[PDB]
């Protein structure tokens, strides 16, 4: 249970919920065919469009609730340690990131932090150690203009049952300057890109000793592979 609620651009804090379409509650989305998969549950919307340069170091901040820890010494801030899973970031080109409908967009993945089998480290593990932040560079080649920036935590602690994987998503409204001429060869739909039966969604991550180490096996994140310039 956590909410993507803040963006940083090359270390510059943009402010809580500034430029975000984020849910009001930290409850997970579990139906991969729901419209809630696009930007999380409908909650707060911002009029701000975050100005970014292609290649910038983007930070995405998860916290247990809106504003940080739910209470002093909250053990589930930024997110419960049991919630092992990947973190993924997608882009969708839109004309107007402040007014565009989240429905029917053409998404492509730009980054993911999934699972390292030799270190037994999940993307969520890195999120926790970075105090809720996940860091990734916008591709140098993406074209100028407005995008929705979709960041997604997929918690797999009870994903061994159908439809029980937990998704925590929000969208950031951005405008890219100094970009290139990249257009994705292929795009995916949200909802639609994920299926409940995907090997990275319907999965038992627990090993011999009951640890969430995926039995040291490689993990296949759902959706397309990250694009390359
Ligand atoms: Cu949770």
Keywords:
31% strand; Coagulation Factor XIII, Chain A, domain 1; 6-stranded mixed β-sheet; mainly beta; 4-stranded antiparallel β-sheet; 229 residues; globular; binds copper (II) ion
Helix-strand layout with pairing:
Blueprint: E1 3-9, E2 12-16, E3 20-21, H1 36-39, E4 50-53, E5 57-63, E6 87-93, E7 107-113, E8 115-116, E9 121-122, H2 123-129, E10 133-137, E11 145-155, E12 166-177
Parallel strand pairs: 4-12
Antiparallel strand pairs: 1-2, 1-5, 3-12, 5-10, 6-7, 6-11, 8-9, 11-12
The chain binds copper (II) ion.
Characterization of the model:
This protein has 229 residues and is mainly β. The protein has helices at residues 36-39, 123-129, and strands spanning 3-9, 12-16, 20-21, 50-53, 57-63, 87-93, 107-113, 115-116, 121-122, 133-137, 145-155, 166-177. The protein has one domain (3-216): Coagulation Factor XIII, Chain A, domain 1, CATH 2.70.50.70. Strands 3, 4, 6, 7, 11 and 12 form a 6-stranded mixed beta sheet that branches. It is globular and about 50 Å long. Cu(2+) 2 binds at residues 1, 83, 168. Cu(2+) 1 binds at residues 1, 83. This is lytic cellulose monooxygenase (C4-dehydrogenating).
């Amino acid at each position: 249970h956590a909410i993507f609620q803040k963006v940083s651009v090359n270390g510059a804090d943009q402010g809580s919920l500034t430029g975000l379409r984020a849910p009001n509650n930290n409850n997970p989305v579990q139906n991969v065919n729901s419209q809630d998969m696009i930007c999380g549950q409908s909650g707060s919307t911002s009029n701000t469009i975050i100005e970014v340069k292609a290649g910038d170091r983007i930070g995405a901040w998860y916290q247990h609730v809106i504003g940080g820890a739910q209470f002093p010494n909250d053990p589930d801030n930024p997110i419960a340690k049991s919630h092992k899973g990947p973190v993924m970031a997608y882009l969708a080109k839109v004309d107007n990131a402040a007014t565009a409908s989240k429905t029917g967009l053409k998404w492509f993945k730009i980054w993911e932090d999934t699972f390292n089998p030799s270190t037994k480290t999940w993307g969520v593990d890195n999120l926790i150690n970075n105090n809720g932040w996940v860091y990734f560079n916008l591709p140098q080649c993406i074209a100028d203009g407005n995008y929705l920036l979709r960041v997604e935590v997929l918690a797999l602690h009870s994903a061994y049952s159908q439809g029980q994987a937990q998704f925590f998503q929000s969208c950031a409204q951005i405008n890219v300057s100094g970009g290139g001429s990249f257009t994705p060869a292929s795009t995916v739909s949200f909802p639609g890109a994920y299926s409940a039966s995907d090997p990275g969604i319907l999965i038992n991550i627990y090993g011999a000793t009951g640890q969430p180490d995926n039995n040291g096996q490689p993990y296949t994140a759902p959706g397309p592979a990250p694009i390359s310039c």
